[PDB]
Design a protein around this ligand. Structure first.
Ligand SMILES: [Mn+2]
Ligand SMILES: [Mn+2]
Ligand SMILES: [Mn+2]
Ligand SMILES: [Mn+2]
Lengths: 198, 198, 198, 198
């Protein structure tokens, strides 16, 4: 079974950028809903798998992808943020971003464009392509996890569901996007980059 | 060509079930953004169709369905809501909700369950199947409209995008559902049934 | 594990309607490919499920839906056909078709229209809706199984992939559709209807 | 407005790798059906756009992308095939296939694997990413064209719909793949690279 992990900071440590009412809620409600549904569904999968029931397996695919991706997606999201966040990353990570996007600001503009373009619920991502050996930007719908659905390795993600900035920025998604860069834990993004730089 | 329709009531006429902020933001900011972007899209479309560009016609599709449906979907919504609605309809429409869904009991439950079940942004609909002559409950993702995508005639629709209840009801989608049944304009729901009960 | 079931007739028992070169091939090659992939994938599912790996689970969803649906779909397909097929069904099944589609020929025209309209690979289906208590016609893409993906109970299906009539009818799909009605095992379609008439 | 382009060679010029029947049927029956239905669709489109009908514009979309892309996809295909092609390209394009995919060895393998992997009807593509200035291997479902759906510039495309190899190669898709490499017009593949190597 899975569990809800604690945050590496407080519910209000991301203020004024990300409201505390949003943070506690995004964690305790939304993210918590995900892990339980994930556990219930996973067991309903074990029931039909041993049973040899393919119809049941297939019927359980959407719930499993939604709650499972919700789990995976948000878990990586928390570690991407930090009260000691913002600025430009350093070392090899910044060189890769330069080698692949020209500069840090060109990279910023694009991840902003891809996240602001998601119609309905989705996520903006910065991923490492293990095969071609370079960084890519991708957008995923609802809770579809980046790696499970694309093979790209998730370095940095931006939750652009309306429950992630509405209480604060309302229908204005670019304001939230302008702000998110000030709480980004580049320590972690580099950390995830070293693991797959293999 | 397309105009933001005026609400047939004041921004706070549906209070307490839907607070005045949500209606103002929904109508003014969201619905309006669809009209404005639909206009630019159809204009960009005449341009590509005119100079036989099929790659541009295809690339423009996502935006047209999104903004086009956003405008279609919300204009309906405003007419389905009303200060003096709620409860139950009057025989003919009720006579139908009866026969096709058991009773208003199970009809509410059916629509509530379709709406609550949407993963991410979407809508729950009570439509009319003009072939079969039967009522149907259909859920559309994002801003995909009933008719254009499924062929069903829209009678009553419930927006379940998070911008429709988050400020008030927050994370509890089902709370937004039990409360919406109060502002439902059964008079208008009936109006759509009649023009198609043929 | 799963296996390839034998046909309730010979590879040429459906001539002149369905070629024998098509029949043996559709079974021994296409259908056989499905069951093995189904078994390999199912075990790769058990590996990651016990491991608690959600990324792997999600990555294996498409193969599992395609080979699993391919298995389910074709298995029902064989029992739908018969050298002693064709004509109109009798008893309750025909009354239901009349009560839901007006007549047998109106039903025929529609299942023909839905199967001839599939763009790319897909299946035409006649299903029983357990909840609304009546027959419906639906079309599914590639190998997506009807019940697992819609809840409808599969009574009769028409494989409209190009590997199902090309050697014989070439790009002409309606000819194959005109012919398929002459080998339809209505004994079985009624049989599947009794089970869900519950 | 749209015309069925004439083949730049005889229906049997690519023999023995693609037999004369397949080319005749592909070009004459399939490709033609797309042109004819694309024309009727765009005409139906001007009509709905003209009288501000957004429901009809949306309902017409599936057909436009299907026939529109069918015409786009095949017209390319004919120019990518040729009596005297095969082997390897000449430096500039080869210089690129080298850098981005390792070597022609792994480039063939990469495209072959993308094509063989399609579930149902589709295409494998070698495109140009005009931002990154890099070559990319992309697979499109049904008749969804590269550019209109992904933004990549199409350089070389392999049809994997069953009507492209079934009469000859039958169920063995990979046999059709190893054989197609022989008729590949590297001269034309180069032609598309040049106009975009900017
Ligand atoms: Mn979230
Ligand atoms: Mn809305
Ligand atoms: Mn088949
Ligand atoms: Mn083709």
């Amino acid at each position: 079974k899975h569990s809800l992990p604690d945050l590496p900071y407080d519910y209000g440590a991301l203020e004024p950028h990300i409201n505390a009412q949003i943070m506690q809620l995004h964690h305790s409600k939304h993210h918590a809903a995900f892990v339980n549904n994930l556990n219930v569904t996973e067991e309903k999968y074990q029931e039909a798998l041993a049973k040899g029931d393919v119809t049941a397996q297939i019927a359980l695919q959407p719930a499993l992808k939604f709650n499972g991706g919700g789990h995976i997606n948000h878990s990586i999201f928390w570690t991407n943020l930090s009260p000691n966040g913002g600025g430009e990353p350093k070392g090899e990570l910044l060189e890769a971003i330069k080698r692949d996007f020209g500069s840090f600001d060109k990279f910023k503009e694009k991840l902003t464009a891809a996240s602001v373009g998601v119609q309905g619920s989705g996520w903006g991502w910065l991923g490492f392509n293990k095969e071609r050996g370079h960084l890519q930007i991708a957008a995923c719908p609802n809770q579809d996890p980046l790696q499970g659905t694309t093979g790209l390795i998730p370095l940095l993600g931006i939750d652009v569901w309306e429950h992630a900035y509405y209480l604060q920025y309302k229908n204005v998604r670019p304001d939230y996007l302008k702000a998110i860069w000030n709480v980004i834990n580049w320590e972690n993004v580099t950390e995830r980059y070293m693991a797959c730089k293999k």
